[PDB]
Amino acid sequence: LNPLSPDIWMYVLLACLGVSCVLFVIARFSPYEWYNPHPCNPDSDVVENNFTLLNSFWFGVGALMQQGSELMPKALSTRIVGGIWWFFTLIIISSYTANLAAFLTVERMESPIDSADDLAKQTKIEYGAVEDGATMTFFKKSKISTYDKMWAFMSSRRQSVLVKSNEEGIQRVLTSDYAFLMESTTIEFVTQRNCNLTQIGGLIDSKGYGVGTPMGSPYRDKITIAILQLQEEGKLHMMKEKWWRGNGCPEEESKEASALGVQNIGGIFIVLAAGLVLSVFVAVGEFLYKSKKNA
Amino acid sequence: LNPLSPDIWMYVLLACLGVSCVLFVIARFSPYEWYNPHPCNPDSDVVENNFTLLNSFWFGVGALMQQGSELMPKALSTRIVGGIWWFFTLIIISSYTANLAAFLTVERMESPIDSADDLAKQTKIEYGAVEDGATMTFFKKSKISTYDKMWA
Amino acid sequence: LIDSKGYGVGTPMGSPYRDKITIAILQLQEEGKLHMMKEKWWRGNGCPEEE
Amino acid sequence: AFLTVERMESPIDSADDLAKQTKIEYGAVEDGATMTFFKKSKISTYDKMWA
Ligand SMILES: *[C@@H]1O[C@H](CO)[C@@H](O[C@@H]2O[C@H](CO)[C@@H](O[C@@H]3O[C@H](CO)[C@@H](O)[C@H](O[C@@H]4O[C@H](CO)[C@@H](O)[C@H](O)[C@@H]4O)[C@@H]3O)[C@H](O)[C@H]2NC(C)=O)[C@H](O)[C@H]1NC(C)=O
Ligand SMILES: *[C@@H]1O[C@H](CO)[C@@H](O[C@@H]2O[C@H](CO)[C@@H](O)[C@H](O)[C@H]2NC(C)=O)[C@H](O)[C@H]1NC(C)=O
Numbered sequence: 137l138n139p140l141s142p143d144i145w146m147y148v149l150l151a152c153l154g155v156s157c158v159l160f161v162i163a164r165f166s167p168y169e170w171y172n173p174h175p176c177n178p179d180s181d182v183v184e185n186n187f188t189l190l191n192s193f194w195f196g197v198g199a200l201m202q203q204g205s206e207l208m209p210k211a212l213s214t215r216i217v218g219g220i221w222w223f224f225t226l227i228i229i230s231s232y233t234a235n236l237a238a239f240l241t242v243e244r245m246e247s248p249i250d251s252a253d254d255l256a257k258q259t260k261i262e263y264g265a266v267e268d269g270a271t272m273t274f275f276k277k278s279k280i281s282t283y284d285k286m287w288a289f290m291s292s293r294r295q296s297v298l299v300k301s302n303e304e305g306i307q308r309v310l311t312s313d314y315a316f317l318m319e320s321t322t323i324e325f326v327t328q329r330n331c332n333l334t335q336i337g338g339l340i341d342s343k344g345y346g347v348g349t350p351m352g353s354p355y356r357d358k359i360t361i362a363i364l365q366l367q368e369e370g371k372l373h374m375m376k377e378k379w380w381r382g383n384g385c386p387e388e389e390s391k392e393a394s395a396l397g398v399q400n401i402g403g404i405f406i407v408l409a410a411g412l413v414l415s416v417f418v419a420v421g422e423f424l425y426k427s428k429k430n431a
Numbered sequence: 432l433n434p435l436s437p438d439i440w441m442y443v444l445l446a447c448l449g450v451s452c453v454l455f456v457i458a459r460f461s462p463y464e465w466y467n468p469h470p471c472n473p474d475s476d477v478v479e480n481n482f483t484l485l486n487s488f489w490f491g492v493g494a495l496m497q498q499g500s501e502l503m504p505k506a507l508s509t510r511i512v513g514g515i516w517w518f519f520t521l522i523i524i525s526s527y528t529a530n531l532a533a534f535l536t537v538e539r540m541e542s543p544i545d546s547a548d549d550l551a552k553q554t555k556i557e558y559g560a561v562e563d564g565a566t567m568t569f570f571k572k573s574k575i576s577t578y579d580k581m582w583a
Numbered sequence: 584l585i586d587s588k589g590y591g592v593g594t595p596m597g598s599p600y601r602d603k604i605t606i607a608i609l610q611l612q613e614e615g616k617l618h619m620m621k622e623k624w625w626r627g628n629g630c631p632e633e634e
Numbered sequence: 635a636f637l638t639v640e641r642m643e644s645p646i647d648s649a650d651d652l653a654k655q656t657k658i659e660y661g662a663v664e665d666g667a668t669m670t671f672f673k674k675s676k677i678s679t680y681d682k683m684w685a
C-alpha cells in the first residue's frame with residue numbers, strides 16, 4: 137500500500153464511485169443508449185438500457201482492474217466517459233508499477249526514533265543506562281522537562297530498565313527492543329565495529345576528558361599548551377581517526393531486491409479471503425431475497 | 432522466477448484452485464446466475480449457468496493473465512469474487528514487473544572493481560602483498576589517504 | 584562539526600581568578616544553567632521549520 | 635526512471651559530498667580562522683576545498 141499515499145487510495149475509490157454514478161445518469165436520457173436487445177429478429181419493439189446501477193459499478197471496477205467489462209459503451213457520451221476513465225486507469229497503474237519499482241531498488245530505512253524527544257512518548261521502546269553512572273546521574277539531577285519524564289520512567293522501573301554495566305546493555309539493545317543511554321565516544325567505538333547498532337539523536341550532555349594533574353603542579357599548564365599543539369597541527373584528530381575507525385561495512389551499496397515473500401506483499405492474501413467471506417454472506421443474502429420473492 | 436519467492440508461486444497457484452472452486456459454489460447457489468440463454472426466445476426450463484467446474488477454472492486463469500475471459504459473472508455475489516480476484520491480480524503483476532525491474536536495475540548499476548579506491552572500501556575482498564617486498568615497502572612510506580588505509 | 588574549538592573566559596596570565604572561574608563555570612554546568620541560557624538566547628521565534 | 639533517479643539522489647550532508655560537486659559555490663571569511671584551518675589542514679578532503 138506504500139507507494140501511493142492513502143489520500144490517493146481514497147480519491148481513487150471515490151473516483152470509481154463517482155464516475156460509475158455519472159455512468160448511470162448519462163445512460164438514461166441519452167437516446168442512442170437505448171438499443172434493440174432482440175437481435176435475432178428485426179423489429180420487435182422492446183427497449184433496454186443495460187447500463188443499470190449495478191453494471192455501472194461493474195464497468196468502473198472492471199475498467200480499474202485493466203480487464204474491462206462486457207459492456208463496451210455504445211453511443212458517444214458513455215464512450216467519452218468510458219475512454220477518459222480508461223486513460224485515468226493507465227496513469228494510475230503505470231504510476232503504481234513505476235513507483236513500486238522505485239521502492240524495491242532504493243530502500244530508505246528510517247528509524248522510529250530520531251531524538252530523545254521521541255523516546256519521551258514511545259513507551260514501547262524502553263530506556264536504559266548503566267547503574268549509578270554519570271549518565272544516570274545526569275537525569276536524576278536534571279531539570280529539563282523531557283529528561284524529567286525520561287527519568288521518572290527509569291526511576292520507577294528497575295532490573296528491566298536499568299543495566300549494571302554497559303557491555304551488558306550492548307547485548308540488550310542487540311537482543312531486545314532497548315534504547316541505551318551512555319557516553320558519546322563510547323558509542324562510536326561500538327557503532328563502527330558492530331554494524332547493526334546506530335547512534336540516533338545527538339549529544340545530550342557536553343563534558344570532556346582532561347589530563348589529570350595533582351592539586352597544584354607546573355605540569356598542568358605546559359601540557360595544556362602541548363594539548364593545543366596537537367589539535368591545531370591536526371595530530372590530535374588523526375589519532376581519533378585511527379583508533380575508532382574499524383571495518384567500515386559499506387552496505388550503502390544496494391543489494392539485490394531480496395525476492396518478495398509473505399512479509400512483503402502479505403496482506404493481499406488477507407484481503408482475498410476478506411473478499412471470499414464477504415461474498416458468501418451476500419450469496420446467502422440474495423438467496424433469501426429470491427426465496428421470499430418466490431414465496 | 433527470481434523476483435518472487437517460491438512460496439508465493441505455490442500460494443498463487445493454490446489461490447487459482449481456491450477462488451475458482453469457490454465461485455463455482457456461488458454460481459450454483461446464487462439464483463441470479465441462473466439465467467435464460469435465449470432472449471431470442473422467451474422460454475422457460477432452459478435456465479442455465481455458464482460457470483461449469485471447467486469454466487470457473489478458465490475464469491480464474493484468464494483473469495490471472497490480465498486478458499480476461501468470455502464469462503464475466505452476472506450475479507452480485509459472484510461479482511464480489513470477480514472484484515477482489517481482479518484486485519488480487521494487479522498486485523501480483525505490478526509486483527512482478529516492479530521487482531523484475533529491480534533485479535535488472537541493481538545488476539546493471541553495479542560494477543566490478545576497477546581502481547584501488549574501489550578496492551580500498553570493500554573489506555570483503557582480501558588483499559595481498561609480498562611479505563618484505565618493495566610493494567609493501569611503498570605502502571609504509573605512502574602518504575596517500577587511499578593507501579595507508581590499505582596499509583591499515 | 585569539522586573543527587572543535589572552545590570559547591574560554593579570558594584571564595591575564597597567572598591570575599588567581601583563572602582557577603575559580605573554572606570552578607565557577609563547572610558549577611553551572613552541573614545544575615544545567617548554560618543549556619537553558621543557550622536555549623534562552625538561541626531559540627527565537629517559532630520559525631515554522633517543522634515542515 | 636524519473637522515480638528511481640529522484641529517489642536515489644540526495645542533498646549534500648557532508649563536506650565530502652560538498653568536496654566533489656563543483657557546481658556548489660563554497661564560502662569563507664576572508665582572513666578568518668576558518669580559511670586559516672584549511673591552509674594548515676592535512677586532510678585530503680579539505681586541501682581540495684582549499685584548492
Ligand atoms: C532485523 O531487525 C529486527 C528488528 O525488528 C530484528 O528483530 C529482533 O530479532 C531478535 C532475534 O532475531 C529478537 O530478540 C530476541 O529473540 C530471541 C529468539 O530466541 C530471544 O532471545 C528473545 O525472545 C525471548 O527471550 C528468551 C531468551 O532470550 C527466549 O527463550 C524466549 O522464548 C523468547 O523468545 C528476544 O526476543 C528481537 O525481539 C527482534 N526485535 C524486534 C522484534 O523488535 C532482526 O533480528 C533483524 N534481522 C537480522 C538478520 O539482523
Ligand atoms: C547483525 O546482527 C546479527 C543478528 O541478526 C548478528 O548475527 C548475524 O545474524 C545473521 C542472521 O542469522 C547472519 O548473517 C549471521 O548469523 C550473523 N552475521 C555475522 C556474524 O556476520 C551480526 O553479528 C550483526 N552484524 C553486524 C555487522 O553488526
Ligand SMILES: O=S1(=O)NCN(C2CC2)c2ccc(F)cc21
Pocket residue numbers: 342343344345608609612617
Ligand atoms: O567540563 S568542561 O571542561 N567545561 C564545561 N563544558 C561545557 C558545556 C560548556 C565542557 C564541554 C565539552 C568538553 F569537552 C569539556 C567541558
Ligand SMILES: O=S1(=O)NCN(C2CC2)c2ccc(F)cc21
Pocket residue numbers: 363364367372587588589590
Ligand atoms: O581548547 S580545548 O580545551 N582543547 C582542545 N580541544 C579539543 C578536543 C580536541 C577543545 C574542543 C572543544 C572545547 F570546548 C575546548 C577544547
Ligand code: NA
Pocket residue numbers: 202203497498
Ligand atoms: Na489488458
